[PDB]
Each structure stands twice: as structure tokens, then as C-alpha cells.
Amino acid sequence: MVPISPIETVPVKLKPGMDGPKVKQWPLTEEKIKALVEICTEMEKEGKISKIGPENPYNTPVFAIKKKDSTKWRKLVDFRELNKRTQDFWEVQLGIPHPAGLKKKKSVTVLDVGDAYFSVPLDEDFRKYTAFTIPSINNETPGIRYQYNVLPQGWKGSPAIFQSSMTKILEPFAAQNPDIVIYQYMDDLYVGSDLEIGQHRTKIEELRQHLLRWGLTTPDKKHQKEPPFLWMGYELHPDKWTVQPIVLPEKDSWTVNDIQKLVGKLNWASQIYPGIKVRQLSKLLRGTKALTEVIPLTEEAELELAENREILKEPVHGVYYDPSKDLIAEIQKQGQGQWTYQIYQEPFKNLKTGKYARMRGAHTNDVKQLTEAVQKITTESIVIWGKTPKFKLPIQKETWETWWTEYWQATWIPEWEFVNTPPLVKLWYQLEKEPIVGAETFYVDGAANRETKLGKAGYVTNKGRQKVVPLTNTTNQKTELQAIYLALQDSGLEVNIVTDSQYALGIIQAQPDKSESELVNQIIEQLIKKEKVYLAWVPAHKGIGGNEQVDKLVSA
């Protein structure tokens, strides 16, 4: 015989304080019992399991499931209880590669390593916890007791330990053959290269021989799976990729659960189909989660669906990453807080696409949203490609300069250039830094009675203009904004406004261009019409003339 290197076992423990499982074996039919004894006898000769004595106090139930449309039963050891008691492991598969970060390959070969999986021994001190019992016929003898010697299918630790064992075996081959890539998924190894077809098969045969060192045999009759690959919802080809087909059903009426998987398909599609939109369809899921409720689609959600159908009419494809070239990211504004982007290296050949959606918030503006989309794309690009793309943004260089130099927060966006494709992001208004000479000065105030919710809002000016308006079903904060709105509505193109509302200044100093509050939107609309606005703050209740006069008018 040829000696084979043993695979180092991983030490495994139970969670602190826990013992192994002691779960009752379910009673089985004489028919099922016979099937299991055959399966287990063969597994025992293969070395996978071993008969044990009666001292071992642990147990996990075993079942016999009819493989559909066959007379053949198959064994299921139900490890759910042991899995609850087993320690946590490091799981490596948490991040799956994105196709747009992969590199072009001339050849990709698949090798079956399914027999490899039980060459992996189980830590000897842990095997006792895997005990299971085949019941005996008629319960007239003790059950046949076994434990595992190898990683069992269904045990919590098998994926991580299998993957880490295979990775360690493959590391020297990969390190000493940098012209190939190796990727393990389930019971297969995928081996890619740009080598000439003969060199590539030579590397394959060398990998087969390297694997033999550990006694791992690979099927000679080469794999049925061949490019393209269906993988993780994608279709991988040698030099292109796409998502698996996106089909949107025709439906006369839509349920909550239908809409959930529509939004599901559309998000998946958005990584290569440009311009996918989901705001209006996600709106139909606001709040409620009664999975069978039918929702009438708004006229707005019907339009969005229609535009999505149009986008999905034809297949698109993505290309793979070329490390020798820069990444470019281009972003467009779509409306209602929605943004779409494309990432490419040569014009018109996208590596991938994507979208970004406004965060739920009281007030917002386009520049902040653009800024957030840029940071999200930056972060995704670091993951996929390890570098920041250069950005093409629909905002003028001077608009950006004005924004970040005056904004109260620190903010930054990485190297970028203006692309002149409407709609452009712009600043709709900017407050003055100093009081305006010759402009009328409006002292504004409002107040409300918290019991009856009656209030007043108004102003007085240095020219003797005055206005007080009675209000119903209102609050102090609403009346403070109403007063500012009245001053904006009744003034000329240049106006100084004096308020004592910290609340109103908080909003205005955040420079929204759109709000959840229709009162704030009205204020924004007025601000856009002005040429100059200076907004001054004073503390309340201090004897401040002007303020002190209209405080007495509106709080009466």
C-alpha cells in the first residue's frame, strides 16, 4: 500500500456547562429497522461509524426516509439537539464572492471531492456525543449502538471543519501554482486558469496527484457540470456573468407575500439591470405583515412595475474585473429618494449595477442622499475589488464646494468628476451669514395652549407691518414654524427674520429640501423664491424688543 498523510483532527467542545444529548429513539417499523441495519453495516466497514457498548449515556434519534419514487430507504440522523449543545465555530462562507469581482478565465474544471468529505476524522474525545441507536426487531434485544468516527452530515461543525481541512490540504498547491485559482463549493473543487488547454489539464492532473497524498480519489469520468455554471442565483460563463432569469408574473391581484417576493426578485435583478426601482412596491408593505392580505396597487406602484417590466424585457450581462484598469462609478437620481448606479472600466461594459434608497427620516436633501450613496458604493467596491472607484456625479463642482464648506458637519466624497446628465443635484437656497441692510426685519412668534391645542402665529416688522393668525389643533412647535412661514409669505425678495424657536433653527440649519411635514415643505418652497434670507435666533422670555411685543400678541 501507499501510505497516506492523516488529516489533523480539530479539537471540538460542547458549550460551557452543557452535556451531550440524551434523546429518545423513535419507534420504527420492522421495514425501516431492516433498512437501517444494512446501511449502517456498510458504513461500519467503510470506517465512518463504530459499534459501542452500553456505558455511553448519550443518544440522537435516527430515521429512515423513503427516497421518493424508489424502494430505497436512506438514513437520517437528527442532530438538532447535539447542534444546540456544540460550540460555535468560525464560518468562512459568510461572504460569497460577487461575480463582478471575479477575473476572466479561459478554462474552469470541476473535480468531485465527495468521497473526501468522510476522510475527515472527528475529534476522538467528541465522538461519544454522536451516539445513536437502531431499535431492535420487536424490542426483544438491545438496540444496536453506534457512534461516528467522521464528520456527520447535519452536525453543526461539519461544514467549517471540512472547509478548513480541505483549505489546509490545498494551500501548498495554490501557493506553488499562482497561475490557477481554486474554489471549493459543496462537494466540488473549481479550478480556473488562463493557461493553454494542455497546460491547464496538466495542472489538473498534478492537482489530482497532490490530492492522492491524502488518499482522496477524484472521479476520472470528468464532471457533468461545465461552463456555464448555475451558482448562487447567478450564471457564470468564462468571460461574462449574469443573474439567473428574472420572470415577473402576470397577476390580477397581489398578496402581501406575493409583493415580498416581487421586491425580492427586483433587488436581485438590480445588480445587473440598470434603473430597477422598488420604492412604490416596498411602500405597499409599510407596517403590516398579514401574509395573505391583498393590497390594491396604487397607480404609482402599477407604473413602477410597468417600468420594471420594460427594463427586464431582454437579457443583459456583466463583465469580469480587469485589475490593470481603473473602476468608474456613475450615479443617477431617480426620484422619491431613489438612486441608481453603474460600475464599469470601459464605457458601456458594466461590471455591475445597483441602487440606493433614502433612509426613513423627517427631513432630507439631495446632496446628503448623494453623499450616502457614494459611501455605500465606496464600501461595496472595497469588498469586491479592494479599491475605491472614481465617481461620475450629477452635481457641479461649485455646488459641492459651496455645500461642504458651509455645512455644519464634516463631510467628504472621494475623487470625482461632474457628469452633465439631468436631473442635476443642486442647492435650492442658502441663508445669509450677516443681516441684510435695507431689508425689512420680521420678528416672528407663535404659541399654543397644550390643553385645548389652540394657538396663534404672527410677526411684527420695523416698518409696522403686523399679522397674527389664530390656529386650531396645533402645538408650540407647529406655531413656531407657521410664524416663520407667514414672514416668508408676506415679505419681499430680501428679508431678515428673528425667531426664538430652537426647534425651527434646528430644522433650517440642517438645510432640508424636502420634508415629511407639509409645513416645512411650504417653508422650503418660500425660501427657494427669495433672493436673500437672514435668520436670527434670540432666547425666549428675556425682554427682547420686537420679540417681546409679538410674544404678547400670540400668547394672548
Partner 1 sequence: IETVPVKLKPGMDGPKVKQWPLTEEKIKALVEICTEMEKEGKISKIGPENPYNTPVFAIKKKDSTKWRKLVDFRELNKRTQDFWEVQLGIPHPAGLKKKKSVTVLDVGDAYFSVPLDEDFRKYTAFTIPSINNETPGIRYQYNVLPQGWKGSPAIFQSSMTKILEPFKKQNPDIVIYQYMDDLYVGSDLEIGQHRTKIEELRQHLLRWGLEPPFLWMGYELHPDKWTVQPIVLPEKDSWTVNDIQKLVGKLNWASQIYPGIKVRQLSKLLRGTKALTEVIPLTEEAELELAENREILKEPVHGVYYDPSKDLIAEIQKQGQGQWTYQIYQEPFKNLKTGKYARMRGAHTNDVKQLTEAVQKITTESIVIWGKTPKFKLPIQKETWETWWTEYWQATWIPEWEFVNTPPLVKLWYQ
Ligand X SMILES: Cc1cc(/C=C/C#N)cc(C)c1Nc1ccnc(Nc2ccc(C#N)cc2)n1
Q: Which parts are annotated binding residues for Mg(2+)? A: 112, 187-188, 445, 480, 500, 551
Min separation Cβ 41 and ligand X, Å = 35
Min separation Cβ 445 and Mg ion, Å = 5
Residue 108 contacts ligand X per CB under 6 A:
yes
Picked from ligand X, partner 1, Mg ion, none, the partner binding residue 236 (CB below 5 to 8 A depending on kind) is: ligand X
Is 182 or 550 the residue whose CB approaches Mg ion more closely? Answer: 550
Residue 102 contacts partner 1 per CB under 8 A:
yes
Picked from ligand X, Mg ion, partner 1, none, the partner binding residue 296 (CB below 5 to 8 A depending on kind) is: none
Residue 193 contacts ligand 4JH per CB under 6 A:
no
- For residue 356, which of 244, 273, 276 has the smallest C-alpha distance? 276
- DSSP classification of residue 127: G
Cis peptide before 228, with omega less than 30 degrees from 0?
yes
Picked from ligand 4JH, partner 1, ligand X, none, the partner binding residue 539 (CB below 5 to 8 A depending on kind) is: partner 1
Q: CB under 8 Å to 376, separation ≥6 — which residues? A: 356
**Angle at which helices 476-490 and 518-529 cross, to 10°:** 20
First to last CA, the chain: 104
Is 28 or 508 the residue whose CB approaches partner 1 more closely? Answer: 508
Picked from ligand X, ligand 4JH, partner 1, none, the partner binding residue 542 (CB below 5 to 8 A depending on kind) is: partner 1
For 337-405, strand residue ranges (E) read 338-346, 349-357, 363-364, 390-393
Q: Considering only residues 296-355, where is the footprint of ligand 4JH by CB under 6 A?
A: 315, 317
Min separation Cβ 235 and ligand X, Å = 9
CB 536 within 8 A of CB 496: yes
Choose, by CB under 6 A, the member of 48, 208, 237, 390 that binds ligand X: 237
Choose, by CB under 6 A, the member of 109, 149, 165, 242 that binds ligand 4JH: 242
* String of contacts with ligand 4JH for each residue 489-528, x by CB under 6 A: ----------------------------------------
Min separation Cβ 237 and ligand 4JH, Å = 5
Residue 375 contacts partner 1 per CB under 8 A:
yes
Choose, by CB under 8 A, the member of 27, 53, 95, 198 that binds partner 1: 95
3-state helix/strand/coil string of 301-344: HHHHHHHHHHHCCCCCCEECCCCCCCCEEEEEEEECCEEEEEEE
Picked from ligand 4JH, partner 1, ligand X, none, the partner binding residue 235 (CB below 5 to 8 A depending on kind) is: ligand 4JH
Q: Considering only residues 153-172, where is the footprint of partner 1 by CB under 8 A?
A: 157, 160-161, 163-164, 167
Cis peptide before 296, with omega less than 30 degrees from 0?
no
Min separation Cβ 193 and ligand X, Å = 9
Tell me the β-bridge partners of 342. Answer: 330, 353
Dist CA 321 CA 103 (whole Å): 5
- Among 170-178, 235-243, 273-281, 505-513, the segment contacting ligand X (CB under 6 A): 235-243
Beta carbons within 10 angstroms of residue 42's beta carbon: 10
DSSP per position, 258-307: HHHHHHHHHHHHTTTSTT---HHHHHTTSS---TT-B-PPPHHHHHHHHH
- Among 236-244, 278-286, 330-338, 481-489, the segment contacting ligand 4JH (CB under 6 A): 236-244
Dist CA 195 CA 376 (whole Å): 36
- For residue 104, which of 271, 269, 318 has the smallest C-alpha distance? 318
Q: In the numeric block, which cell numbers belong to residue 298?
A: 396604487
Binding footprint of ligand 4JH on the chain (CB under 6 A): 235, 237, 240-242, 315, 317
